[PDB]
Amino acid sequence: MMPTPVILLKEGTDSSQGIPQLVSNISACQVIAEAVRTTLGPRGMDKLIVDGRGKATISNDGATILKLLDVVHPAAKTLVDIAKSQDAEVGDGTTSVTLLAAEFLK
Amino acid sequence: MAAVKTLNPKAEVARAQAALAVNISAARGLQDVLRTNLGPKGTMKMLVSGAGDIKLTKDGNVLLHEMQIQHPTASLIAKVATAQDDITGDGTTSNVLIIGELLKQADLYISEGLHPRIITEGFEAAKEKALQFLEEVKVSREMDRETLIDVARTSLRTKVHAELADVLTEAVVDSILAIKKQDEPIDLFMIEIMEMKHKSETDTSLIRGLV
Amino acid sequence: AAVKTLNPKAEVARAQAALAVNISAARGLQDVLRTNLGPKGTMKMLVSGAGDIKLTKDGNVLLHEMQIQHPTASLIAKVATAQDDITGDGTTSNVLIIGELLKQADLYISEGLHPRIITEGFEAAKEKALQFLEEVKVSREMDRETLIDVARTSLRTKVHAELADVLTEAVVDSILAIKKQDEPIDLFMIEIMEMKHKSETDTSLIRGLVLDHGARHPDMKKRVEDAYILTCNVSLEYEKTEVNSGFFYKSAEEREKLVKAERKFIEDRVKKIIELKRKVCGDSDKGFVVINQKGIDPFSLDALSKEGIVALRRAKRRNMERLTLACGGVALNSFDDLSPDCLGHAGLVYEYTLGEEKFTFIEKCNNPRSVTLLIKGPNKHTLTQIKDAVRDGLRAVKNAIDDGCVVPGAGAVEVAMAEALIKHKPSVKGRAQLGVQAFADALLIIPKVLAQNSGFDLQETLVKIQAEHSESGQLVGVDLNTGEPMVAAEVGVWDNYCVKKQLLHSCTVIATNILLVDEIMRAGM
Amino acid sequence: GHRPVLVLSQNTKRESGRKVQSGNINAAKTIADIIRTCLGPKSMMKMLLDPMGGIVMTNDGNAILREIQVQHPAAKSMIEISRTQDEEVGDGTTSVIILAGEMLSVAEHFLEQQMHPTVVISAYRKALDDMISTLKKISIPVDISDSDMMLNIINSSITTKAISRWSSLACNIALDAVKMVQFEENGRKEIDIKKYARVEKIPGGIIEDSCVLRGVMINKDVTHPRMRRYIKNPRIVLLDSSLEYKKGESQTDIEITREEDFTRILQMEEEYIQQLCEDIIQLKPDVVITEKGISDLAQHYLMRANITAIRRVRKTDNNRIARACGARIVSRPEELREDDVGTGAGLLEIKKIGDEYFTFITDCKDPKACTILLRGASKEILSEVERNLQDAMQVCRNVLLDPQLVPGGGASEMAVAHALTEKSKAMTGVEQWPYRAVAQALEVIPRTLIQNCGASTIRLLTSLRAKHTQENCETWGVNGETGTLVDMKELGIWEPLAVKLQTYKTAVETAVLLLRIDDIVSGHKK
Amino acid sequence: ALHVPKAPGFAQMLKEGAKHFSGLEEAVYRNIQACKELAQTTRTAYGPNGMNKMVINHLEKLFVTNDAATILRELEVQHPAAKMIVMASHMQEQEVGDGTNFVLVFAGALLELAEELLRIGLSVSEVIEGYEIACRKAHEILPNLVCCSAKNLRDIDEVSSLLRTSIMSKQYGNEVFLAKLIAQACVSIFPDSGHFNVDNIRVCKILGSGISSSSVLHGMVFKKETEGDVTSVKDAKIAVYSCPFDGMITETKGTVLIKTAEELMNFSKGEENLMDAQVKAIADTGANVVVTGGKVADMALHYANKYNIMLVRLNSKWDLRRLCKTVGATALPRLTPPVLEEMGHCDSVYLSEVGDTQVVVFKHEKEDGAISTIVLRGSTDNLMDDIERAVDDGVNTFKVLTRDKRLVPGGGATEIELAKQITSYGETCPGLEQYAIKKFAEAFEAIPRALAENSGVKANEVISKLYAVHQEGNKNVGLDIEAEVPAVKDMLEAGILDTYLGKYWAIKLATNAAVTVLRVDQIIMAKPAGGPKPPSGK
Amino acid sequence: ALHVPKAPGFAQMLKEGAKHFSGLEEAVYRNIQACKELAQTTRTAYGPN
């Protein structure tokens, strides 16, 4: 890399490319799936999430948990989006969609 | 911008016309300051150091050393004048003036699209012809007392006041003639210079001995 | 220093320092603007604080977009601004001549000469040069070919050869369209409109008006073949009473009656327009176009559209005069007594849509006295550059038309003037001959810079041209392709006589005033 | 706790004694030295940097002084006296500053020698009285009907400015404008060049095209393009009231209960506009100028009668138009009468200069107001030319008011100095020494002229003094260009007596004022 | 001897934050480097095998796309020369709708080869002249490279086949289904008159069922609910009002002046009766659907419910005009009943529930109408946005085909043929312009090179094979992306065809941008400002 | 047009803390004023009184 007195893009622009960035995307999707993994089945459990104001939400629904997480990873947001889509179209299976997508990527 | 500034971001660079203009501006500033030194009718300069010591002089080398200057071209011209003073002991002001005027006259043509190399070639040819002419015009003479008196006066009148110069002329001529041996190099280490601070400036003289 | 003693926070440059500061600033400006001169000059890209990109070659545009905070630069910029405002050309030459005058004057001042003698020599040389310029001008009937040559001379120095060739015909035809015999040319009647949808060579001349707004009603026709034009300045939208009226009703029916009667004032004028349209054209072939400087509310828009009338609102103020001159109607501030004799005529009116904005074309006028130049280009900076180029070309053609004389270009008149000044120099008494020589050398800057930009050497080209001029007596300039002397009059390189006279006067005055400044003060704090 | 206790407030400084007098005199000398080099035909210009980003490149002393901000109160007093000299007579601004500085310089010597300032002030006042007497004695009359003499006087006034190159044109412009502005009504003579001799500067063109117009010129265009831009012999009606419907002063609200009232009220607004326009038209004018807006309907009604309208003209411009074309500004058009209609303009022409429209009401017959159209290289050049023209017009009006002249080129200074010395030769008290000091300090003007010319000050000044010691040599001065002694009857450099009297009085009074002062106190609030 | 001062003149007068670059090395090479960097940034997303890029702009908005124009728009490009090239790409997008990546890569290749020519000794003027000559030669050659024409635009199969190539570059895996959808939508639009309006195709994005569930609707879909009790109409007679569904009021000021008890007791009853009469008059024309652009009064809604009138409120006027075009209605400015010629008609208007969003559907049974809507389904918002971008590309391709029906082979066949022909023309030209012409011809190799690089094969072998085949005399042979090894195949038979107008405008704009960048010799940059955008951008 | 730059040459080459006074008014008059001030300070202690 060279200083290039006049830069192409403005300072602070971060770029990630190649195989490592897609492996990182897969890892982020794995993390998102793990965030709701335990809430599946008749022996599933509930998660408690506290927002900034201090109110807590207790839920077994995968879509609710994913919405309450402030996910900012661009690749990991796709799992939240498909969970919302499954909730909208069907209403059930919002955990299975994330588990299956992350398992495909893994 | 430049190639150098890419490798070293905090680098100061002047390229081509910029560098030439910087050098010529520094030379012209030095010439402008040292113009008033030349000749017996030149003006005395007043130099005050950091500690507050007062130094009055007209010498070109002394003024160059005592100006508060931080320019590279000034440093080179100061080195040239220092060598001039160390070897010949005279002509430092003329040295600076001629360097500055040479640079100005060269810039007179370089600004018209002429390459500096042609100017330097002309300078070399003119220098050769000038050296030949100077060899032709020199006046070979038997260095009697009168000629040495005239030379010493021609230097000291420029350096100091006319009456003090008249005294110092006889002083230096007699001092040189005393220590001179026939067909031998003159050793100036054998003329002690001692400073006393009680009488007037015209009371300086030559002692045929040691103090 | 006295000022610093009275005001500690004061900046002062006195005598030789003042002269050096002024001359250094002038030399820096000249060094920057040297590369602009001539069609072979280089193009500069200017980026503003907001990142706006501007590509230009004007001396004035460059001067304003240069990031300079110098007093002498400000004075020279003001001189160039006046030059551009009046003559419209010669700003780069203005800066170059000012800088070279200052340099030549400093050449003698550094030898102990007082600036007053140099200024006297400058005055004498300026008088002689003006006399020679009067002698050398070519008074010719300004036919189309000469105007084409002048416009090409300006535009080739301003833009690429093909774009210059297109703009030459466009500018000359636009000027000739609005020209009236022995009557001053009003450049306000040539509208300049920018569209950003095609190539730069698509710029052309529409013998009519192009409006940057279209009909606001979807049901109005988008193309009208034979159109009556009604240029009006009457408000067709709802207006409130000036004296705070307000309504008072006691029932819903009364409110409905008041609502219906609230718009009768506007409906009366809309009905007058509709009745006039019905009277003038009882068939659907003829069309009616209403161009209103004021607004039209949706109710009146619908009422007009139901009658097959195209209505445009919020037109430009100058567009009233432009439409009156082009279509041939009468701009109306009221509909008190409107008759068919107040209607203009257009042989084709259609609306062109480009992205979000819409444009209206009013073409096929009988004999339009106001035309429009449609600037087209793929980029905004291309449009701005073409706009500057057409401004310069219009100014050059108008100047050439104003006084029938025209001056050969390519620096030929500079060389001839310098030779005449050298010949006249012995007649000048005193030491002002040095000032005269400095003025001649400063005048010689234009062929020097032209040869330098063309890639040749200043000394050889200049001496060749001067020898050719002295041997034959002809007006020979610089051939930018070969470097040999060339007769500018025969080839077709022309310069405006008024531009040269203004150059001489302004450059001499500003150089004389700058040379006599012995102090710059900043003590107003 | 335990805040300090003290009599005067904090940051209240005070200096007293010889220090205050020395500081005041040094401040005055510094102010004089600022503009010392801007005197004479060979003066060099100074470039001033305005705080608001502007540039003032001028040679006038008053402009330079007023562009400089100072802290010492003595310098403030010097700037004030320069401004007063500029306002009173129009020139002599850089001479009075130098004279005051020299007088204070020669008073400092007596202050250092145990002389009370009151004695110095008394000697200064006696000297000033004798200076005025001698100046009135050595004066000569002038025939104001002789145009050549007036032109020569204006030339001598403007030989020191940057306009000396076009001196002939400048003198003609100044004389014509001053004679045009000259007015007399109800037995009161008046030359108001501040309000009726307007200078308009248009950058571009050449200065040789600048001229004084037999009329006025404003930067205005027709309200509507259909109006004529060229009328041969226009009948001009001037207004200072709106030609549009406006709300009344009292609070007014309408109440509408029937259908037709809204349209009726709008029609009444239109009818009021029509009535106003008809009232204007009844006088059959050719052009209407007002200071307030004109409605579009009013424009239509005026155009129906073939009348050109200019919308928003400033009050001063409207007054100048009224004076030039013989009109009378009216407010209510219903009270317009035939006398108020302005006939006398010989042409109305609205032409285009550069990219702007300008209205010309020139060719007036016997106009009492005029505009001076200036063309030039740039704005700063035009500003300096305007300042020089102001100096020329002020000198011309001073000569018209007082037809006396005194020799220039320092001749008056040396003549008055010699007369004062001769008078002092009979003085016996201690006051004679400051008296002679003032007499000799008067010689600073020819010395400054010689210094600016570049000649030898000592030899030329001694020769001038020896020449003035003779009998008929009160008109012998110094040539400021060639640096030689010459009789002012040959060179022709004469200046108005009023200017010299004002300069002398202001210089002596400033010296007295600054000598009276001691014990400077500062730092207090208001 | 410690510091290097600024040179007297312009260097000292320059402002503290300003920057000045002059000369070849300091200006032209830097501009070429910046443009090459931008081209390299966008290169990888070229062709059917191009890869999407996640771009997050300054507002934390995520874009997943392989559209070059969108990527350049979201990127915050600061270098002025790269800004100029981006302007050229956006102009190409506006004029045609496709070929932005072609413009970018061609400009980058042209500027790189221009830098090479400048380094070997050529001047800027010579390079520019050679580039212009070669561009004119290319525009002359291009009409001869046309292999086929559309020859029919009212056929679903033909239009789908034509748009397959256009929308195969994006959504490579499933382009046949999207081509069929866009073909149906475009054929519904484009009436007997030759004019085709791009804005007549609307896109509705509803989450839930994957993009395979998308469909085309001959009408309008609005994401809202009816405001009344009626939710379905079978023979709709829409009446459209631009005015609020309420009794109109005076524009000046309304004041109910009551002077007696009777007026006070009768005012509300009279207002109710008046509004009831107005609604009954509207309903007496048969209008069973009322669409308004303003608010709806409570009494108005009550009386609409009483008379079995469906109420739909369209907040935006653009939607109102689109609905008027769809159903052939007239936006009445008053609440008067519509006359027979200004009442809209629709085969069916009903309230539906797609996914989890309530929608109001204006449905035409006929396969015609002024406006047709494409209903996009998907599991992600970004996916539907990318599908919408592909739909826009297909619609723009159809518009271009309506403008000009000529087609040129894709897959790099046209670029290789142009390069070969321009190179052959290069030797015939004596003088220094031959180098620039040859470099202009070589710059066309960047298209097949990028395609081969993205497809995962060796670009050099592909280009060698393409030259061999084109020298044999086959001008319709391009890169075969359906292979694991460098291979070529005929593009006319494979149906991979590019529009003639797209290539023409892309070549012209790229050449103009490269030449204009080359013309710049000095750069004077002002100090950057931290202002919160000019007011022009709102 | 808001600041006065240093004159090219010696003025720009001068060090940051250095001072240069040249010419009659700038040097000789200032020196004479300083000497006069010193003499004034010592003057009042001259003679028996």
Ligand SMILES: Nc1ncnc2c1ncn2[C@@H]1O[C@H](COP(=O)(O)OP(=O)(O)O)[C@@H](O)[C@H]1O
């Ligand atoms: N084709 C040409 N051949 C030779 N000289 C030309 C040609 N065209 C213009 N010139 C010269 O170039 C000058 C124009 O330079 P230009 O860039 O217009 O500067 P400015 O805008 O300040 O006039 C004219 O003086 C003219 O003599």
Ligand SMILES: Nc1ncnc2c1ncn2[C@@H]1O[C@H](COP(=O)(O)OP(=O)(O)O)[C@@H](O)[C@H]1O
């Ligand atoms: N040609 C001349 N020769 C000699 N003295 C002149 C000449 N012209 C003007 N003067 C003198 O210069 C003075 C005017 O100088 P000026 O710059 O106008 O100062 P001020 O602004 O104070 O009037 C007058 O007193 C006059 O005597």
Ligand SMILES: Nc1ncnc2c1ncn2[C@@H]1O[C@H](COP(=O)(O)OP(=O)(O)O)[C@@H](O)[C@H]1O
């Ligand atoms: N099936 C295919 N086989 C080979 N090449 C193809 C195929 N489909 C499209 N292409 C090529 O892809 C290119 C289009 O790239 P694209 O990503 O659309 O860039 P742009 O949007 O700038 O046109 C065309 O030049 C075409 O030759």
Ligand SMILES: [Mg+2]
């Ligand atoms: Mg479940």
Ligand SMILES: [Mg+2]
């Ligand atoms: Mg020596």
Ligand SMILES: [Mg+2]
């Ligand atoms: Mg030009």
Ligand SMILES: [Mg+2]
């Ligand atoms: Mg005066």
Ligand SMILES: [Mg+2]
């Ligand atoms: Mg594409």
